[PDB]
Design a protein around this ligand. Structure first.
Ligand SMILES: [Cu+]
Length: 105
């Protein structure tokens, strides 16, 4: 694939390491809708709100299958490690007007 998944299910925001590359989900949006990272970097999304949110990459983007991330509860996190350069668009499954991309260089 173009990314590996450190944790298949969400984990506590408070457990996210200092230094992590974090995208906040707040105000019903990805607060960094265009993020540029380097190959090998891990991106961590953190849901700051009460409604559950995820990240969802359609098939062919991160790999053959869609990556429909797990629903993060408030103050939960979810990470992806990008292993190949590319431009990877995603959206929130419950709230698909919220869209983002990770550009991996
Ligand atoms: Cu969402």
């Amino acid at each position: 694939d173009k990314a590996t998944i450190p944790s298949e299910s969400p984990f506590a925001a408070a457990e996210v390491a200092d230094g992590a590359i974090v995208v906040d989900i707040a105000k019903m949006k990805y607060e960094t809708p265009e993020l540029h990272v380097k190959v090998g970097d891990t991106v961590t999304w953190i849901n700051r709100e009460a409604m559950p949110h995820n990240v969802h990459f359609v098939a062919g983007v991160l790999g053959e299958a869609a990556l429909k991330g797990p629903m993060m509860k408030k103050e939960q996190a979810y990470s992806l490690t990008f292993t190949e350069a590319g431009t990877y668009d995603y959206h929130c499954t419950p709230h698909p007007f919220a869209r983002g991309k990770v550009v991996v260089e």
